[PDB]
RNA sequence: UAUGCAAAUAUAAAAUUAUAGUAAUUAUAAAUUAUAUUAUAUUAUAUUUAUUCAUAUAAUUAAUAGGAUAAUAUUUGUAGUUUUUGAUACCAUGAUAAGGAUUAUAAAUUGAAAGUGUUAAUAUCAUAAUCAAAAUUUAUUAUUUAUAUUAAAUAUGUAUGUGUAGAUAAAAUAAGAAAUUAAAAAGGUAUUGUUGCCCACCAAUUUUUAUAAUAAAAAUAACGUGCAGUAAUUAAUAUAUUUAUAAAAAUAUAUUUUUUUUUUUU
């Protein structure tokens, strides 16, 4: 009785009533409850994971001989979680000079991959020359048999995305099932960077090819970084690719799709500053990603909105 | 529990009256203060009646013997320096030590307001004849 | 016929998003479809609302010293303000400035989680002091006016759910938020470890540990606000070796690892 | 009789003995527990359809 | 309450003449704050130690536009007299000004210089009934 | 206070009123209505102590949001103004207090339901709420009374007057008190019932007639006098005679549709 309701735990007139347990009965537990055991939820935090590497790990496997031999050259290149500020010109000079002296293929290529990664972080454009000078001959040209070491490919790809470069499309294509079959070994961050670059450059077709492979190779869709999905989708103006992207959008999860919308509305919105290159206007893809989000969320009832104009009829 | 009636408005020109009244109440208080300081110090400085009650012992004894001998020859100077104010007098008697434990226990002293009378006081009425215009808390003559 | 509290208001979110977003129907709260919240107040109105609601101290109150009216009326009597230049003639000015309002990080636990001595409580989380945008506290610029409106105002419009949120906060909320909104791994995979303002302190720790002063070094390690570089952990454990202190070497290592991002794993 | 206390306990404690109830119920009968729409003067507000 | 002199007239009950624990009465009304003592002049309703610093309220703490009245626990300082600046205090009905500066004020708090309950009474803030009751007590003439 | 005149309840009758056309009825008795000196034993009020009684102020109540030792979400930094109106300073139902008057001693309580601001369906004037340092008029409150008297939150300057008017307060309980009590008979024109009903004159009007200060009678809901009646503030009722603002009142007889008080030779 009142506008303030009784709280059923603290009130003995609830607790000890006939619909609950009186204090003179024997007070044991009624039934056991196993909730967590029967059907358990997987852990997904609202906050992203604080320790994760957040980059493209380039996997440095060197024989612990050349690793010691080449130390004064390698000390200038990135080691794990450490990014020395050495100017990229110098590093490339060192590779060009000293590398023909080393005899190992595997070593020369690990070293090269480090150089590429280093040049990806500084966004120096003259590093593809290195690909055409050493690797192109035995990997990409005229159906050469040789199969490049994975780390090298990851590194070059990462470089083509960081420095936006038409070249990526040629490399990526070699990684599908009939080629090197490297695509299932890519990191989630790899996909993230790829999508973002392709999106900036604006290839709907690059975007489609990449989303198809990602899906087939079972990438982690929900953990692909939202910004990069948005920038990729934003690039899609062509009727067919557009169709593809609706049908595809059904592959994300409820949550992912909600934040695809949030992120999208921010990047053309308040957070338009957050990007190094501003987005381009897609009103169509924006509207659609919002629409999709609305379709996939639970629906709420707002009767004064729906039935605002309802009039009954006696027909 | 009835709804509280509203209070009438303040007054017209009562702000001026209140200002003036407090103003010169304070100005008056300056002289009341000055005067009562004068009185307080005049009292501290001037002599008082003897603090001890002579009706009990060791004080009843003839002025030529006992405690009075002890006072005339050893304590006199000091007793006069403090002007027979009852606090230092009682302390001096404690420090003379030749009475010793008795001061508080066997000896009786006059009550506060009587002990505060000016030396020479003859009639009891004197307690009530001191000035009431002055704020000393009975520490004025 | 129409009585409003406020004449005009404004939209929380801007043209690019809104103009398209409107073609998608959004469900409003069924029992009160229209929402006019404190994000929607105009600049003027927000200023006014934000002054009020702080008992005596707050700038709204005529006698706080922050009042912009030149005159105030007590029971039909009009009182003219005493300007501060004049107030100062008999009432000396001892004013430190805004740094006086912010204690160091070191004291945050003495103070139950706060660095800020201002009149409103200041949260380090994004949401409680949120206006349209996420709340962020400047420790340099703290004023009585509080332009960004990040403080927890007790009496303003829309305050109640904020107050309730603040009273539900977890045991480390202030501390955790302060720590996670600063101090986070860079987008390159680099550690947050190198900062210009803390560098000489890390240098000093290393130096102290090399001369073998373990206690002095540990005593400086205490005052570090930011993640210390690997070199610090190296120095400190190397110092633990000759005296055999193992417990200390281990607690050092374990401190730098899986708390501080595994700087210690080396 | 009247109820002194009330507890929520799984239905398998007391359920009509398997030989009294019709044969496999899950498979041969579609059952839904639902609420009467009409106003029920007395009796239960839920029924088994 | 019977008469509402403020907002609180509506919210509060008197409860007759009710006893509160020692030195906690809900409302601090210091009728005694100006209560003359020559010998106790420096110890009564003032700081318990003469080595205490003056309160907060003698200082300008922050960036101010200005104030209307200074607080009543502010202590009167030689500059209050000398500087010839407005010194106001909030008393009732409105405000008390120190207009006529004296050194005799110095070193005491304005609590002590402002008589809270004046011997002066407004007949116009009184109901005819209340005026009757003030004539019974032998305050107002009639 | 029975020499003139003077038939008249002791019942011969057909629903009430009305001079025998007026209104639609009237009259009536036992339900119900707290105080009228009826009796030992189951055991006591006439003691003690008290009574100078004051305290309130400086306006914005509207939503969720998780972080080390987790198999990777920048979801770091979650951004869609604007259609409603009551608890307010204001009319806006509910609910708990206080207040001794006859279930007694044994293995046992001297505190009660009849309701004292804050609480749940009547809305359609207004932001009034303490975070200090503040302005006595309000029935409803046990203060320190003469050897020694202001040190920590700031803490009360006033009234010595022969224990002295009127009027008041408290107690039979781990304390200590000791001798002057009630029951049983009663009336209602009202009908949840005396704050109940009713009675005449005094205006308008309506209607019938056998027109007497001012025709009579019947309907009737104003205004103004009162207080006639219900054992009703000197009981009523009937006849008689007188009297008169109006009910009515005085006296002479009968009488209870008024309540009762009771010597079988003292
Ligand atoms: O999800 C996020 C959040 C933030 N950022 C941050 O945005 C800043 C500029 O935003 P951009 O996303 O335009 O820069 P970028 O492509 O050059 O950055 P990379 O991701 O290639 O490093 C970047 O330098 C990065 O720090 C992201 O790149 N992604
Ligand atoms: Mg009530
Ligand atoms: Mg308020
Ligand atoms: Mg006629
Ligand atoms: Mg007639
Ligand atoms: Mg009568
Ligand atoms: Mg009569
Ligand atoms: Mg009668
Ligand atoms: Mg009669
Ligand atoms: Mg008459
Ligand atoms: Mg008659």
Three-class HEC string of C88-99: HHHCCECCCCHH
Give the long-range contacts of residues A22-28, CB within 8 A, separation 24 or more: A22/D4, A22/D5, A25/D4, A25/D5
Distance B41 CA to F184 C1' (A): 90
Q: Which residues pair with C74 in a beta bridge?
A: C77
* Distance of CA A105 from the midpoint of ligand 9 (Å): 152
Distance A240 CA to F222 C1' (A): 99
Report the 10 Å Cβ neighbour count for A263: 20
Chain E residues 80-99 within an 8 A CB cutoff of chain B: 91-94, 96-97, 99
Instruction: Output the CA–CA distances (angstroms, integers) from residue C125 to A105, C122, E28, E35, in the order listed.
Output: 53, 9, 40, 53
Chain F bases under 7 Å from protein CB? 53-70, 72-84, 89-91, 116-120, 128-142, 146-158, 160
DSSP state of B103: H
| Structure-token match 């106003």, residue found | D39
Contact (CB, 8 A) for A16 and A23:
yes
State the DSSP H helix or E strand holding residue D33, giving kind and residue range, or none if neither.
strand D33-35
Cis peptide before B58 (omega within 30 of 0): yes
Contact (CB, 8 A) for C116 and C137:
yes
Contact (CB, 8 A) for B63 and B50:
no
Q: Is A123 in the pocket of ligand 1 (CB under 6 A)?
A: no
Resolution attained, angstroms: 7.8
Q: B121-139 burial, b for 16+ CB within 10 Å, e for fewer?
A: eeeeebeeebeeebbbeeb
Distance D16 CA to F4 C1' (A): 123
d(CA A202, CA A206): 8
CA of A270: nucleotide with nearest C1': F79
CA of C126: nucleotide with nearest C1': F77
Among the listed residues C76, E1, E119, the one whose alpha carbon sits nearest the alpha carbon of residue B9: C76
Contact (CB, 8 A) for B114 and E17:
no
Provide the shortest C-alpha distance from residue B38 to chain E (in Å): 9
d(CA A213, CA A232): 15
Q: E36-68 burial, b for 16+ CB within 10 Å, e for fewer?
A: bbbbbbeeeebeeeeeeeeeeebbbebebbbbb
Smallest Cβ–Cβ distance between B4 and the set E2, E34, E119 belongs to: E2
Among the listed residues C86, A291, D38, the one whose alpha carbon sits nearest the alpha carbon of residue E80: C86
Contact (CB, 8 A) for B140 and B130:
yes
Q: Is C168 in the pocket of ligand 1 (CB under 6 A)?
A: no
d(CA C142, CA C99): 8
Contact (CB, 8 A) for A218 and A211:
no
Contact (CB, 8 A) for A168 and A161:
yes
DSSP state of B125: G
Whether B and E touch (3+ CB pairs < 8 Å), yes or no: yes
d(CA A204, CA A217): 20
Tokens in use for C109?
A: 């636990």
């Amino acid at each position: 009785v009142g506008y303030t309701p009784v709280n059923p735990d603290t009130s003995p007139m609830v607790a000890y009533s006939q619909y609950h347990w009186h204090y003179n009965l024997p007070q044991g537990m009624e039934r056991p409850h196993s909730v967590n055991r029967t059907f358990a939820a997987p852990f997904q935090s609202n906050h992203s994971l604080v320790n994760k590497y957040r980059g493209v790990w380039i996997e440095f496997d060197m024989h612990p001989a050349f690793s010691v031999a080449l130390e004064p050259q390698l000390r200038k290149l990135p080691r794990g979680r450490t990014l020395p500020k050495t100017p990229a010109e110098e590093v490339i000079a060192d590779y060009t000079a000293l590398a023909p002296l080393v005899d190992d293929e595997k070593t020369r290529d690990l070293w090269l991959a480090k150089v590429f990664q280093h040049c990806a972080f500084q966004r120096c454009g003259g590093a593809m020359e290195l690909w055409e000078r050493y690797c192109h001959q035995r990997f990409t040209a005229e159906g050469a048999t040789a199969k490049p070491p994975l780390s090298l490919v990851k590194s070059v790809l990462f470089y083509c995305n960081k420095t936006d470069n038409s070249g990526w499309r040629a490399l990526f294509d070699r990684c599908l099932k009939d080629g090197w079959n490297y695509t299932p070994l890519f990191d989630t961050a790899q996909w993230s960077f790829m999508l973002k670059s392709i999106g900036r450059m604006g290839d709907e077709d690059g975007v489609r090819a990449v989303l198809e492979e990602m899906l087939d190779v079972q990438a982690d869709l929900d953990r692909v970084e939202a910004r990069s999905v948005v920038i990729a989708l934003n690039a899609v103006t062509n009727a067919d690719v557009y169709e593809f992207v609706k049908k595809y959008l059904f592959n994300f999860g409820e949550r992912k799709v909600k934040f695809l919308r949030t992120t999208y509305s921010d990047l053309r919105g308040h957070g338009a500053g957050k990007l190094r290159i501003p987005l381009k206007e897609n009103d169509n893809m924006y509207y659609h990603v919002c629409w999709h989000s609305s379709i996939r969320s639970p629906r709420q009832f707002s009767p004064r909105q729906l039935y605002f104009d309802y009039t009954p009829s006696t027909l | 529990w009835a709804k509280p009636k509203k209070r009438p408005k303040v007054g017209q020109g009562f702000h001026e009256k209140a200002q003036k009244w407090r103003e010169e109440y304070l100005l008056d208080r300056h002289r009341a203060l000055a005067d009562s300081l004068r009185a307080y110090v005049e009292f501290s400085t001037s002599k008082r009646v003897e603090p001890w009650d002579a009706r009990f012992k060791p004080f009843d004894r003839i002025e030529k013997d006992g405690v009075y001998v002890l006072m005339r020859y050893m304590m006199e100077e000091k007793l006069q320096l403090c002007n027979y104010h009852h606090r230092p007098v009682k302390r001096l008697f404690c420090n003379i030590g030749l009475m010793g434990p008795q001061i508080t226990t066997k000896a009786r002293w006059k009550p506060y307001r009587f002990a505060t009378n000016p030396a020479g006081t003859s009639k009891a009425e004197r307690m009530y004849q001191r000035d009431k215009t002055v704020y000393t808390h009975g520490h004025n003559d | 016929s129409v009585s409003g509290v406020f004449s005009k208001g404004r939209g929380i979110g801007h043209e690019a998003t809104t103009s398209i977003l409107r073609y998608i129907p959004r469900a409003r709260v069924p029992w009160q479809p229209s929402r006019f919240g404190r994000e929607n107040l105009t600049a003027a109105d927000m200023a006014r609302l934000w002054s009020r609601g702080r008992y005596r101290d707050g700038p709204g109150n005529y006698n706080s010293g922050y009042c912009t009216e030149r005159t105030h009326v007590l029971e039909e009597n009009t009182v003219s303000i005493i300007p501060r230049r004049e107030l100062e003639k008999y009432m000396p000015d001892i004013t430190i400035g805004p740094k006086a309002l912010v204690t160091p990080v070191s004291l945050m636990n003495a103070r139950n989680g706060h660095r800020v001595t201002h009149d409103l409580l200041h949260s380090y989380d994004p949401h409680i002091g949120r206006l349209g945008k996420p709340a962020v506290v400047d420790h340099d610029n703290i004023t009585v006016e509080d332009p960004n409106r990040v403080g927890l105002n007790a009496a303003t419009l829309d305050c109640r759910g904020r107050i309730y949120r603040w009273l539900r906060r977890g045991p480390f909320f202030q501390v955790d938020n302060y720590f996670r909104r600063s101090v986070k791994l860079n987008r390159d995979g680099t550690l947050p470890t190198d900062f210009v303002h803390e560098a000489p302190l890390m240098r000093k720790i290393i130096r102290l540990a090399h001369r073998g002063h373990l206690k002095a070094a540990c005593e400086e390690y205490r005052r570090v606000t930011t993640v210390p570089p690997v070199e610090v952990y190296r120095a400190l454990t190397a110092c633990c070796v000759p005296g055999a202190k193992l417990a200390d070497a281990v607690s050092i290592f374990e401190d730098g690892d899986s708390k501080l991002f595994y700087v210690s794993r080396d | 009789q009247g109820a002194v206390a009330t507890a929520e306990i799984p239905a398998f404690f007391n359920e009509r003995p398997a030989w009294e109830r019709p044969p496999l119920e899950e498979t041969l009968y579609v059952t839904t527990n639902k609420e009467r729409y009409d106003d029920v003067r007395g009796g239960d507000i839920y029924y088994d359809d | 309450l019977k008469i509402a002199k403020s907002a609180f007239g509506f919210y509060l009950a008197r409860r007759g003449q009710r006893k509160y624990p020692f030195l906690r009465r809900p409302h601090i009304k210091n009728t005694h704050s100006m209560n003359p003592s020559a010998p106790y002049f420096w110890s009564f309703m003032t700081a318990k130690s003469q080595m205490a610093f003056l309160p907060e309220e003698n200082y300008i703490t922050g960036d101010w536009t200005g104030k209307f009245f200074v607080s009543k626990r502010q202590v009167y300082t030689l500059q209050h007299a000398t500087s010839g600046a407005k010194v106001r205090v909030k008393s009732f009905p409105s405000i008390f000004e120190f207009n006529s500066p004296s050194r005799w004020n110095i070193g005491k708090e304005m609590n002590t210089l402002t008589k809270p309950r004046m011997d002066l009474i407004d007949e116009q803030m009184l109901t005819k009934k209340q005026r009757l009751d003030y004539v019974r007590a032998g305050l107002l003439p009639k």
